[PDB]
User: Which sequence fits this backbone?
DNA sequence: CACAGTGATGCAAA
DNA sequence: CACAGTGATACAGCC
DNA sequence: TTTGCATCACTGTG
DNA sequence: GGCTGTATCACTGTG
């Protein structure tokens, strides 16, 4: 005996396609003689409960511009966009859920953990007090996604994924809010529920807006409302406080209405010129918001003070487009680490070439330096040369042994000491913006942060002025300035990182190849459904049922 | 009709379907690019310069007393006369309709340089709802100049809009709007001769009449071959508008109109059916009170144009039409269009 | 790339990075353009690193910042 | 209670990694209470009798320069190549089986198949006659194989795979030979047993020969010998016939010592030049052989007649290297089809622009023609532009619907009939060299092949003389001239193709990142072991236990 | 001594470790490319022209009587005075040893083009076994000229070679070989002072003596610091060969030799240990009966050389050594090796 | 005539 | 301080 | 009522 | 005494 739910959990979690599962079931049944595994149709029937559009729910007050039906599943991402010849050409296949249905399905799946945590917090398991659900949104733009032969629109070779993850649930049982659930691994791919999958270029602003507008409309509609849902008997009420902090820097620039990623304004958190950032490096403040960006765009369009182009650009600091997604200003840990690793790699390249003294940069010497650095790194730290910069190279490059090996190629000893001190300061600052709870895991490092940042800035301005005099990278500016304020505001930076969505990209790329139909009108639907089934805690609980 | 190929430089990606071409003192200007303006040309208006079968797009800086307008995608554009371009409606890159009137003129022209002035005007009265794909013309009568605006496409009203069909469109009411730019007042007239809405049609501006030919009714999904004549009388009191249906019309949608000679127009391009393009060109001869439409010679279309699925274009105002064909071959390649020029 | 790999540090203050490169001038379709200087043996440097304008780059299309 | 062999077969054929199988077994045991699935160590113990190096065997006479041990498994592919600083740099990691042990294992895993085949033709199961087994050899060079971080050799980003597949076994009863076994899917990826995996460039002659020399020496030793094995409790004697046919054109030119890439001499079977092939187009023969190439290289090196470079190359017929692998002259069906499809694509591009009427054209105009063809090939045939042509694109492009679709772009109807006739002739010729048994499958198409070839050549020389007057492509020459005879000699063309190795490349790519340790010193051996297990008929036949 | 970089054209891939460089009346030639000869240069020999620190490898055309020799990766090469070069042994691109002697001379020289004549000579008598990395020199005594060949590395004998260790390399016997080129004969001599085989050593050819320094014995995996003098006398009868050990030797393997001035040589490059490179250069001063080994000033090496794992090179014969470092990385082909030229005064 | 998938749908069988 | 693998080996523990 | 297998328009390794 | 379960090693891939 083996239940259909358990069979589905095994099949989904152990990366088995339907054909492979059918072969396994057929062989087991034929050889043993008893039906250990349930049939594929039974599994498909049993997989409908977990998917969206099955449980009844109510919204009080009723959602504005959103239908009241509670039986809607996978729907077309175009949202009825006109495909007529006369109108704007449409070359994009997209599939998405409804946001409210996805949230209600996620809450129904998490029901068991919610009740278990409520019991563990010494609270009676029948309260209907208004909860508070925190969901982090992520939007990522992939590349090198090959198109398929067949009839249909000439879709591009890049995809866009929009997903959400439930981070925290709190309930009021007095003068304080008690937490009943918290994700143990926020960046794990096992908790990143896809919501929309489209095949369109990230920089294709028109198509991106046309596809993603309904989701933003739903999110704005249900920011101020309550959701009543029957959970474990009693109906209970939930509230939602969305927090989108998973986008990368370029996508934040594109959706927040800011200018191109290369300009005189180089921060999505504050409004500071590159020269001012380079000359200050320490003291700033967070003074940017979605409503402020909307007002800035309105000022830019209306030109109320009748100013020229330069004066107008100074007045509206970088905003030249109307924002359409409300993103909380945040620092992405993964991309910050990647950028810092690339910066330190270039710093090592310069240092091993004696730029401070006798900087006779030769067209051949500039490549000799890179070649010798790459060979030395391969021989000592076992790192191969890579064109781009990824996370593992960053982690293996920021280690102290990397600087110890690089110092063998620098003739001077003062440069050795300066580089070692800089690397030590960076490594002391890193665990503050990467941990899931800085106030409890690295309290000394969290407290001793302003002094370390000031020393880092002073060293970078004194002993490395040959590169940073009127020029500081955006990630360096963010790390030096807005780490403590953002930690105080949110609680932990890194728990809201984009690692979950990046791993969901890998899961998407695997499923599109070996877990879905190969047609052009069904691949996105099948991939979305299988991904949602994969990120189900009810199914994942069986795989860990061995130990209790 | 002579057909030639024009090679576009490094601004090719800036040309997307639905753009607008303005004619100022023999010069051609381009508006309605793809995406929000970059830092190279923050204004959003370009100097469409074509010479020896080569196209260049140079930035143009607005004046200090102008409003930087967003990049529209299907505005209703009309000329006005001391020469102005009046644009209404359109779609911003964020896929939201705009209901603002922009008047664009020239402040000062330097040596091969032109500075524009853009002024936003707010309408009062029975203001037209946000829409795209409509037509606006200017009518002169008894020394008074007004504007006539017809219907197009629009999103569903906020009281009937659902996120499952957020991007769905429907034809506007067939009412005729009369706009006075001297005080910016709009009056709506419901004409019994107009029952089914139209979109992507052709409007011709005579002395005191506006002729409407072609269209695509969304409700019936047909392309009626009906020709309408809207006549506006402008006495000292309230204006009067009369609509007459006339025989001899043609069926076309999203066609391109050029003015080769006075009391004469040329219609090129369109879509007779969903996939059957209208390869024929029409000649419209206008009189003081009578009009006629005849069929002219079909130009020698190239291989790519005859087998293309879609084509767009605009009028340069000098008896020429600038029209494009999708490349449909983009393997990380910048060249995605095969622009051509046609001379009548 | 072929034999024209642009990913080389143009100058000590070379802000160009492969990870975060963005088109500043309206001519770099997929890869940044480089300007060649004939001082000494000659060297190719990124256009953005020279702090030039779009019109200046168009006119150009030499002594670099450390060679002037 | 599933047996360990059954569990191993399920895990191997369902593409389940060891960790995933462990999770499934743990969950099933915990939630059922009975050990339905056997554990990982039981599976590992049960898989031992399947890898090469378990069964005893004998060689009589003993193989020259080959050890007599019968317990050698995965051995180092470098074959003890010197790795000191003074010696030539070594930048490759390779793992390989011994050829004799691999063939012993391959013959042993099909004992039940051999017995069933013998019973199917009324022969005693205790026969000890000499089983003559023909083994097809394939070698492919892949590209874009990512290097891994670590310490050791700086391996390049390319790999080379060597594989064999047992084709058929014949037993001599009385005075006639009868086929005991015959592969029903010769090009299937399920019979592509690997022998040597290495990370080196295909066009790296020094490393390629340094790695592949031991395998060729083993094959030469085994060519003149016999193998005594035990099957069903009876001793049996086996003889081996090796046929190397999976090589592509570039690899066969590089190995057989011919001049690389395109040159004056284009075919690997005859001695014709490009101009002679373009002038004749219908009549040739087969003269190339390994011994002939060796003699040609010796003549080239010695220069007995004291001739200049041109005369010496004319006398040597394009041989400028010493061959080291005996590759049978043949045509690869997959690459022949791909090349012919590419040539027809180019012909369509030229005929769209009417080159036959306009002698010259510009680069922009040619690019416009190509763009027009690519755009129009999507509306009607549902295809997309591809940088390099592949098999599915070839099979879709060679249909009559493609020429019907491209017909409406040629202005003149005179060219339509010529293009349609050319396509019809190609489609008549294709099944002859694509079938696995032309004589018993398409006798009508096989009998009338010379007439179709002559008509095709006349059409090329009369109508399409603007591209094929003085220059004919090598694959076109092979198809037109060298094919009515390879069918008579061997028996089929598509059977001896590289499809199996090309499909096994996909399994290699999957296993490298899903069923192998992530390290530079274990990945090759893990991939080799898992591929050999995946290509085991004893494990395969359990999955078809229902039928 | 000065070090200067040199850039190669579009055929840099033709340069591989172990390449031989030949000198003919001030002209430099390159032999032993990578892979079999292509259509551009069927002969396999190239003109190595350096102009303003830029390297070009031009094609060369053999004569009508030439024998087109296969590329050799580690041959033993010596000069002989019509000036000619004698090449023995080596490894062919098919990774098999050769046992043939090639004599290369200049037939006719025109403007910016040279024609070579290659002749194959077959040895008789106790023919030396195929080997690579050995040293052959030319000795003139009492008006008669012969050649002295020392041992190197070879494969296992054909009756003791197993396919599991096919590419295993073993040192050859320390027997010395005397070769006569007028009649192409050979004779082997066994000496008591030589008991362990040596490979990748340095040979100096004086009037009637051959000096052997350095080496690498694979049997013991050591690099002895032994200096041997081989004196060969050519009377009317059979030749007499004696060997003598001399204190003052150095330990080096695969070292590069150059001749700067008369009765003076310079040793640059080589390996002292497996993971260490001999960064010091040595000066050898010849004499009537004694030689002097001294240490010269260390050249200003670049940062890439001092921290590289291996390096190779050859001698141009004009006091300039052409050396190379496997720089960059195996990636998109933007330089695979880095080539320097070292001028020793 | 490469071939083993690939998942949902639908009709036939016990 | 990303995280779920990736397989072979060795050793503690239980029926 | 629950199982089982055929069918459709595609894939990837070239 | 023999089968079972789990820690450990140096790495991966999506960025
Ligand atoms: Ca990304
Ligand atoms: Ca291949
Ligand atoms: Zn900031
Ligand atoms: Zn730069
Ligand atoms: Zn310069
Ligand atoms: Zn031939």
Assistant:
């Amino acid at each position: 005996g083996l239940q259909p739910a358990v069979c589905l959990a095994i099949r989904v979690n152990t990366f088995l396609s339907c054909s492979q599962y059918h072969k396994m079931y057929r062989t087991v049944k034929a050889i043993t003689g008893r039906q250990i595994f349930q049939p594929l149709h039974a599994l498909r029937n049993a997989e409908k409960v977990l998917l969206p559009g099955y449980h009844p729910f109510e919204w009080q007050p009723p959602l504005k511009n959103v239908s009241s039906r509670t039986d809607v599943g996978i729907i077309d991402g175009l949202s009825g966009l006109a495909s007529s010849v006369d109108e704007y050409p449409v070359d994009t296949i997209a599939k998405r859920f409804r946001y409210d249905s996805a949230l209600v399905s996620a809450l129904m799946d998490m029901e068991e953990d919610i009740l278990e945590g409520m019991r563990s917090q010494d609270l009676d398991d029948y309260l209907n007090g208004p909860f508070t659900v925190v969901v982090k949104e992520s939007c990522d733009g992939m590349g090198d996604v090959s198109e398929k032969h067949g009839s249909g629109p000439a879709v591009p070779e890049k995809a866009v994924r929009f997903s959400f993850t439930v981070m925290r649930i709190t309930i009021e049982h007095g003068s304080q809010n008690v937490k009943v659930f918290e994700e143990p691994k926020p960046n794990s791919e096992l908790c990143c529920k896809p919501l929309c999958l489209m095949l369109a270029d990230e920089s294709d602003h028109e198509t991106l807006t046309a596809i993603l507008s309904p989701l933003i409309a739903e999110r704005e509609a249900m920011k101020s409302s309550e959701l009543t849902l029957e959970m474990g008997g009693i109906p209970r009420t939930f509230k939602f406080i969305f927090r989108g902090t998973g986008y990368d820097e370029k996508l934040v620039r594109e959706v927040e209405g800011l200018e191109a990623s290369g300009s005189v304004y180089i921060c999505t958190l504050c409004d500071t010129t590159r020269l001012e950032a380079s000359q200050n490096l320490v003291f700033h403040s967070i003074t940017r918001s979605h409503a402020e960006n909307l007002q800035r765009y309105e000022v830019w369009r209306s030109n109320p003070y009748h100013e020229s182009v330069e004066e107008l650009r100074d007045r509206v600091k970088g905003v030249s487009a109307k924002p359409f997604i409300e993103t909380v200003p945040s620092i992405d840990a993964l991309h910050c680490d990647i950028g810092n690793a690339a910066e330190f790699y270039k710093i090592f390249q310069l240092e091993i070439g004696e730029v401070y003294k006798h900087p006779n940069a030769s067209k051949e010497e500039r490549k000799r330096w890179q070649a010798t650095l790459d060979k030395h790194l391969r021989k000592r730290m076992n790192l191969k040369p890579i064109m781009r910069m990824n996370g593992n190279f960053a982690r293996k490059l920021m280690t102290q042994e990397t600087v110890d090996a690089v110092c063998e190629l620098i003739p001077s000893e003062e440069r050795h000491e300066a580089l070692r001190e800089l690397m030590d300061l960076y490594l002391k600052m890193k665990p503050v913006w990467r941990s899931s709870c800085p106030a409890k895991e690295c309290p000394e490092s969290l407290c001793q942060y302003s002094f370390n940042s000031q020393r880092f800035a002073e060293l970078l301005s004194t002993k490395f002025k040959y590169r940073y005099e009127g020029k500081i990278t955006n990630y360096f500016h963010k790390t030096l300035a807005h780490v403590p304020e953002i930690i105080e505001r949110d609680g932990s930076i890194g728990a809201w990182a984009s690692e979950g969505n990046e791993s969901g990209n890998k899961l998407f790329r695997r499923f599109r190849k070996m877990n879905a139909r190969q047609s052009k009108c069904y691949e996105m639907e099948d991939v979305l459904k299988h991904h949602w089934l994969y990120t189900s805690k009810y199914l994942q609980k069986f795989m860990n049922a061995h130990n209790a | 009709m002579s057909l030639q190929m024009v090679t576009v430089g490094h601004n090719i990606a800036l040309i997307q379907p639905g753009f607008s071409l303005m004619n100022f003192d023999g010069q051609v200007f381009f508006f309605g690019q793809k995406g929000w303006p970059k830092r190279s040309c923050p204004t959003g208006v370009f100097h469409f310069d074509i010479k020896q079968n080569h196209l260049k797009l140079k930035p143009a800086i607005f004046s200090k007393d102008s409003c930087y307008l967003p990049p529209l995608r299907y505005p209703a554009t009309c000329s006005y006369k001391k020469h102005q371009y009046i644009i209404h409606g359109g779609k911003t890159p964020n896929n939201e309709l705009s209901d603002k009137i922009y008047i664009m003129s020239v402040a000062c022209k330097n040596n091969k340089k032109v500075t524009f002035r853009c002024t936003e005007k707010d309408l009062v009265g029975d203001v037209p709802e946000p829409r795209y794909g409509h037509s606006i013309d200017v009518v002169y009568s008894r020394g008074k100049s007004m504007g006539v605006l017809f219907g197009g496409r629009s999103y569903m009203p906020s009281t009937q809009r659902t996120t499952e069909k957020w991007n769905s469109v429907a034809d506007c009411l067939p009412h005729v709007f009369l706009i006075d730019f001297e005080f910016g007042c709009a009056t709506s007239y419901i004409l019994p001769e107009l029952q089914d809405g139209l979109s992507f049609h052709v409007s011709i501006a005579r002395n005191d009449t506006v002729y409407i030919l072609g269209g695509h009714s969304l409700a019936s999904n047909i392309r009626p071959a009906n020709l309408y004549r809207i006549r506006v009388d402008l006495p000292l009191g309230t204006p009067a508008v009369n609509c007459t249906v006339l025989p001899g019309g043609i069926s076309v949608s999203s066609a391109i109109l050029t003015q080769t000679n006075n009391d004469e127009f040329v219609i090129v391009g369109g879509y007779q059916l969903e996939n059957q393009k209208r390869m024929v060109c029409s000649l419209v001869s206008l009189g003081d009170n009578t009009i006629e439409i005849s069929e002219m010679e079909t130009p020698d279309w190239t291989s790519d144009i005859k087998h293309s699925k879609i084509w767009f274009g605009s009028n340069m105002g000098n008896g020429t039409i600038f029209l494009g064909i999708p490349g449909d071959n983009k393997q990380a390649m910048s060249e995605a269009f095969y622009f051509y020029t046609l001379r009548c | 790339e072929s034999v024209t790999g642009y990913w080389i540090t143009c100058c000590p203050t070379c802000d160009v990075d492969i990870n975060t490169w963005v088109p500043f001038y309206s001519t770099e379709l997929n890869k940044p353009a480089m300007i060649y200087c004939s001082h000494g043996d000659g060297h190719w440097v990124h256009a953005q690193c020279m702090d030039l304008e779009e019109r200046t780059l168009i006119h150009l299309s030499y002594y670099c910042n450390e060679h002037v």
In short: The two ends of chain D are 20 Å apart (CA to CA). The CA atoms of residues 157 and 410 of chain D lie 44 Å apart. Residues A 140-141, 248 surround calcium ion (ligand 1) (CB under 6 Å). The first strand of chain D starts at residue 58 and ends at 59.
